[PDB]
C-alpha cells in the first residue's frame with residue numbers, strides 16, 4: 001500500500017548469512033542488478049506489525065552513514081530489504097584477515113564515519129541503545145554505517161543505563177568510547193579477563209580501560225571523555241565527529257605508523 005512495496009519475483013535470495021529466532025538473513029539481488037540484504041520473518045514467531053517496526057524506523061531515519069532501507073514485502077511471508085554491505089559487521093572485519101592491515105589513520109576515519117552517523121541520530125533525538133562494532137556495517141572503500149542487528153551487553157553500556165535504565169544519546173556516547181577500544185585493539189572484547197559482574201562494580205568505583213598498546217594518548221583521553229561518570233559532561237557526537245575528522249592535522253600531526261597502529 002506504499003511506495004516501498006516490491007513484487008516477490010524482484011528478490012532473488014542467493015546466500016544465507018544467518019538464522020535467528022524470528023527468521024533469516026540473506027544476501028540477494030533486487031531487480032536482477034542491485035546487491036541486497038534480505039531479512040526474513042518466520043510466520044507465527046512475531047507479530048507482522050512488530051517485525052515491520054524495523055522498516056518504519058528505517059523510513060524515518062535516513063543518512064549516508066545509517067543503513068539504508070530499500071524495500072519491503074509487507075504481507076506474510078514478510079521480507080525487509082536493505083543495502084548490502086560487502087564486508088559484514090565491523091567486529092568480524094576487525095578480527096578477520098583485514099585486521100592486520102588497518103592502522104590508526106583508517107581506524108580513526110571509520111570512527112569519524114560512525115560518529116557522523118551518530119551525529120545524525122543526535123540531531124533526530126533518537127537513541128541507539130546498542131552502539132558497538134557488532135552493530136556497524138562495513139562496505140567498499142572502508143565505508144561504515146550505523147545499524148542494528150536487533151540480537152546483555154553491559155560491557156558496552158553506560159552505568160546509569162545498565163543500572164537505572166537511563167538510556168540517552170549520552171549513554172550512546174559512552175558506548176562509542178568502548179567502540180573506540182574495539183577499533184584500536186582490532187576487535188578484542190573490552191575489559192579483557194573481566195566477567196559482567198566485575199565490570200559493573202569497578203566502573204562505579206571509577207575503573208576505566210587503560211590506553212591500548214600503540215594508541216596515542218590523545219585518543220585514549222577522548223575515550224575517557226566519553227566515559228565520564230556524569231552523562232551531561234560527555235561530549236556530543238557533533239564534537240566527536242569534528243575531532244575525529246581533524247585528528248591528524250590538529251591533534252596528532254606528528255603521528256608515525258607503527259607495528260599495529
Ligand SMILES: CN1CCN(CCC(=O)Nc2ccc3ncnc(Nc4ccc(NC(=O)Nc5cc(C(C)(C)C)nn5-c5cccc(N)c5)cc4)c3c2)CC1
Pocket residue numbers: 017018025037039053054055057058061066067082083084085086087088089092128137146147148149150
Ligand atoms: C562469525 N559471524 C557469523 C555470521 N556473522 C553475521 C553474518 C551477517 O549478518 N552478514 C551480513 C553481511 C552483509 C550485510 N549487509 C547488510 N546488512 C546485513 N545485515 C543486516 C540487515 C538488517 C539490519 N537492520 C538494521 O540495522 N536495522 C536497524 C537500523 C536501525 C537504525 C536506523 C541504525 C536505528 N534500527 N534498526 C532497527 C530498528 C528496529 C528494530 C531492529 N531490530 C533494528 C542490520 C544488519 C548484512 C549482514 C556474524 C558473526
